[PDB]
Amino acid sequence: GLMQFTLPVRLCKEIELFHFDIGPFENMWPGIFVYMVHRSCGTSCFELEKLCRFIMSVKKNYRRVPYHNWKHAVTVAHCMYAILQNNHTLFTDLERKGLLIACLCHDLDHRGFSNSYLQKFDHPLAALYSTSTMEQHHFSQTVSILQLEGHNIFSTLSSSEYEQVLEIIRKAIIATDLALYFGNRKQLEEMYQTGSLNLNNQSHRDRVIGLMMTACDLCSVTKLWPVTKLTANDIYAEFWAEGDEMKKLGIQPIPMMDRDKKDEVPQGQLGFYNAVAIPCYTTLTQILPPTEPLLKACRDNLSQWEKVIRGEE
Numbered sequence: 001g002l003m004q005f006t007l008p009v010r011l012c013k014e015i016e017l018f019h020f021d022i023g024p025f026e027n028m029w030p031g032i033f034v035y036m037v038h039r040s041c042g043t044s045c046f047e048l049e050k051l052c053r054f055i056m057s058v059k060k061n062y063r064r065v066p067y068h069n070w071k072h073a074v075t076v077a078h079c080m081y082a083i084l085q086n087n088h089t090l091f092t093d094l095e096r097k098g099l100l101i102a103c104l105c106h107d108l109d110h111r112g113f114s115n116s117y118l119q120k121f122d123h124p125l126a127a128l129y130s131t132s133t134m135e136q137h138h139f140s141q142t143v144s145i146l147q148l149e150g151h152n153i154f155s156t157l158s159s160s161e162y163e164q165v166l167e168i169i170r171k172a173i174i175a176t177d178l179a180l181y182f183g184n185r186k187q188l189e190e191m192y193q194t195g196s197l198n199l200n201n202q203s204h205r206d207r208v209i210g211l212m213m214t215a216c217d218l219c220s221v222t223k224l225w226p227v228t229k230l231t232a233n234d235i236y237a238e239f240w241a242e243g244d245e246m247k248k249l250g251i252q253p254i255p256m257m258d259r260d261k262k263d264e265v266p267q268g269q270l271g272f273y274n275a276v277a278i279p280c281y282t283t284l285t286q287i288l289p290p291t292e293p294l295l296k297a298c299r300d301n302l303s304q305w306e307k308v309i310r311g312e313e
């Protein structure tokens with residue numbers, strides 16, 4: 001109970017910034033995560049014996065894929081921590097508790113293929129969940145790990161607080177389905193502009209938490225140029241793997257996913273920053289002003305991809 005985690009000085013300071021990289025030392029990520037829980041939430045939130053067992057079972061159920069891995073899990077949780085620490089008073093104790101666990105669990109058992117590839121493959125999970133296929137799986141695995149003897153980090157809540165938190169986590173995890181991001185953002189757009197956004201409306205909060213989740217999930221585009229650029233290879237290595245498996249099914253994959261069209265990547269990144277990242281971080285900044293640094297970083301990186309195209313690297 002009197003046992004804080006402490007980080008070396010440089011991490012202690014840099015972890016509070018949106019653009020923190022968690023580093024190449026696997027073995028420090030669990031301590032990073034706990035550290036963030038203890039400062040976001042309190043040393044009380046979770047029994048340390050149980051948090052640690054939960055964290056290690058979650059680590060175990062992420063696979064060795066290029067991008068959709070344990071590192072992504074912890075990275076996305078850090079971004080949610082940065083958002084929660086720059087917006088101290090806007091979120092309930094339950095919401096701080098739920099959302100950090102949501103982000104750690106959000107990609108549980110990912111194999112590195114899109115919802116689409118599951119549907120064209122006719123994978124069993126596409127029979128069992130027609131929309132938001134991997135995300136309903138991810139929520140499912142989170143509940144499974146929550147139910148292992150020794151792993152219920154929520155056991156100290158009330159029947160009703162318990163049901164609220166699992167409902168926060170489920171919406172949080174389903175919202176990472178980028179197909180759903182577009183309308184979620186258009187609606188928050190209308191609601192902020194007409195002036196009807198109201199954070200005491202639960203369904204308004206849901207939408208806002210959903211956009212924070214998209215923001216954290218994409219946060220690799222909000223890093224310093226060299227982190228953003230080296231992560232983009234991981235993200236593309238999965239895309240190209242999927243393009244190959246598309247070709248194996250006798251389907252020409254989209255160019256994004258075709259490893260024969262690497263040349264078109266820098267223009268592809270442009271589309272994505274323009275169609276997805278910049279709008280996500282704009283609306284989020286409007287709703288939560290202190291998250292502006294994610295917009296500024298995203299813009300710097302768009303600029304860096306423009307240079308890649310203009311032959312200046």
Ligand SMILES: Nc1cnc2cc(Cl)ccc2n1
Binds near residue numbers: 219221232272
């Ligand atoms: N084409 C894409 C698709 N999804 C992406 C996600 C991140 Cl975080 C970064 C770059 C991406 N580029």
Ligand SMILES: [Mg+2]
Binds near residue numbers: 107
């Ligand atoms: Mg995902």
Ligand SMILES: [Zn+2]
Binds near residue numbers: 076106107176217
């Ligand atoms: Zn993710």
